[PDB]
Ligand binder design. Structure first.
Ligand SMILES: Nc1ncnc2c1ncn2[C@@H]1O[C@H](CSCC[C@H](N)C(=O)O)[C@@H](O)[C@H]1O
Ligand code: NA
Lengths: 265, 265
């Protein structure tokens, strides 16, 4: 009679919370999705081992089109768990799954876990200063999407930081790198010429948030576009004007150039 | 000789990540602060009992002025942990403490935990749509804070939602309720008359996120300003233009008036 939406956290199998692990161990069935994101620091096997339950993996279609036929039926007579990387309900289409649950006479509860939305605080940028977020998508054929460029523009105009998620193709396990995202943005700037993203733009790169040894780098595009940030996934952040305290952290912790203390403050 | 910043999560001791627990159990000394937020579902004892360590609670002064004199000295010879509610670097000034660690020659690591910043996803509101955030601070003496009103106005104009952290006076065990925040906002509206926050403004209240049965309510100020949302902590959210699915969730899950389903595109 109960469906538990349980977050797996940021990077590996230990990023799930104590509450989440125990509840998962008490469930009769366990489902999971790895299409919105992937636990780059672990494997399905390790997650299964830690929880001690077999895990039924669901595709994007299984979820969006048949959640009520695959997951909800079982939850009507048992305790069911639905695991997602990060914090449940952050992925924009997940909140609606609780509506489906209610409609099926199934109670649902949410077990939170660390999300990149809050984890980016490790960059030293004040969380309250972040504005609208966007995802950088690869162009395709005749389609050249650039909305993410406008998001950066509207945020920075008001001193707000912009968190940029990078395109990902889970099935094919192909991630977009920060370096690639920067190239794309430089190309979008050359078209809209709005003075939003150039070689002189300051950016921050966060890789492997959640691991004990994440990669936090800050600096100008011209110096980071070819730098090696390590294994995916990467997160790109275009900061707005900085509070001196944020700048001091980027310099001391993310190896940013002293220059930002006078140029971006 | 290392310093670990470890988040405890939203509501109780089980909101700590598995990683956080394992590492905290093997630390020589454990410090913590409980003034930046309220974990309504647990006690120091339970947390100590969980990690199996005595915990020295530090006041805002001990931290902001003597962190390098109380905590860092031990981190040079032992493995020290600093515990905080939610995620340690979210809506706090704790990030700067890492700079102090560096300067004292102490290596530091950050272990995230569920934060209210991502937990807002449980309101049905698309998290990528949130704009700049703010805090509704209690007026003191003749000083009446009002900046948070402009943040709401600025976000709303661009169709972005606004997350409002609520004030806390730890040493007085006082935690601002969404009701109090609403009253303060109406007073500011009367003072500025921008038409930003009135009796007809739709708002969302999330209380005790992290608990199994949080209070999630959405509706017009006039109807919610006096409603009982339960014990703190509370956060108030002023949504911007809603997507149809956000509205459906607010109505089906947060009990919002069916009329909000009719969005003015
Ligand atoms: N479980 C919870 N439910 C509702 N609001 C919460 C909450 N935890 C924190 N808050 C809100 O956030 C304020 C503290 S701000 C500090 C936030 C913390 N580092 C985090 O990561 O969540 C509180 O006064 C309250 O308004
Ligand atoms: Na945000």
């Amino acid at each position: 009679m109960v469906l538990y939406f349980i977050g797996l956290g940021l990077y590996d199998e230990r990023d799930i919370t104590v509450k989440g692990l125990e509840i998962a161990k008490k469930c009769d069935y366990v489902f999971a999705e790895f299409y919105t994101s992937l636990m780059a620091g672990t494997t399905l096997g390790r997650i299964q081992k830690l929880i001690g339950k077999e895990i039924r993996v669901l595709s994007r279609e299984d979820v969006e089109l048949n959640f009520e036929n695959i997951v909800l039926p079982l939850a009507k007579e048992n305790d069911v768990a639905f695991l997602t990387p990060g914090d449940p309900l952050v992925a924009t289409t997940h909140a609606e799954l609780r509506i489906r649950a209610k409609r099926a006479g199934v109670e649902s509860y949410v077990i939170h876990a660390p999300s990149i939305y809050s984890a980016v605080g490790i960059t030293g940028l004040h969380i309250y200063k972040f504005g609208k977020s966007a995802t950088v998508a690869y162009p395709e054929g005749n389609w050249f999407p650039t909305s993410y460029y406008d998001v950066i523009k509207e945020n920075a105009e008001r001193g707000m930081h912009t968190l940029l998620f990078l395109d990902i193709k889970a099935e094919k396990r192909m991630y977009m790198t920060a370096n690639e995202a920067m190239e794309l943005l430089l190309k979008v700037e050359d078209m809209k010429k709005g003075g939003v993203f150039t070689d002189d733009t300051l950016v921050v790169v966060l890789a492997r948030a959640g691991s004990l040894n994440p990669t936090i780098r800050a600096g100008y595009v011209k110096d980071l576009i070819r730098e090696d940030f390590g294994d995916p996934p990467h997160i790109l952040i275009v900061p707005g004007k900085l509070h001196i305290v944020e700048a001091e952290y980027l310099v001391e912790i993310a190896g940013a150039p002293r220059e930002i203390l006078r140029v971006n403050v």
